[PDB]
Amino acid sequence: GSSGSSGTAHGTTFELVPTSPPKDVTVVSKEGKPKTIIVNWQPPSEANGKITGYIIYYSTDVNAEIHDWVIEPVVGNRLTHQIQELTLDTPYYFKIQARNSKGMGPMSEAVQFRTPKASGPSSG
Numbered sequence: 001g002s003s004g005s006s007g008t009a010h011g012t013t014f015e016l017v018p019t020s021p022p023k024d025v026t027v028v029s030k031e032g033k034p035k036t037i038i039v040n041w042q043p044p045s046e047a048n049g050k051i052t053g054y055i056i057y058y059s060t061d062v063n064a065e066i067h068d069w070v071i072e073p074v075v076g077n078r079l080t081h082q083i084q085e086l087t088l089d090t091p092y093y094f095k096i097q098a099r100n101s102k103g104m105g106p107m108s109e110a111v112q113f114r115t116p117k118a119s120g121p122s123s124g
Helices: none
Strands: 023-029 037-042 053-059 070-074 080-083 091-099 111-114
Touching: 023 111, 037 091, 053 080, 070 080
Parallel strands: none
Antiparallel strands: 023 037, 037 080, 053 070, 053 091, 091 111
């Protein structure tokens, strides 16, 4: 594997951010609430190191610069996130990433998910 001696096995001497995109990227819609949607995902196999949290990006535009893209930081190292108060009949692009004690990594391909539609005056 590599060349080097061993002695002070007091953990790692250095960490390497997750330079790999997440897996199990799915985007569903809330039951009853069209303006609300749930985004699930899973940690990458590489996982050069450990995990502490995740970040999701979403914006009406797709060609827009990450700068414009909003940052939805997830707490409790959660693998799922919910976004309410959104627009209907509009193509929204979502992105999921993995960040650890060190930092964040590369974002996955833009997930195009067409928002649902309100069917019936009843909801709840």
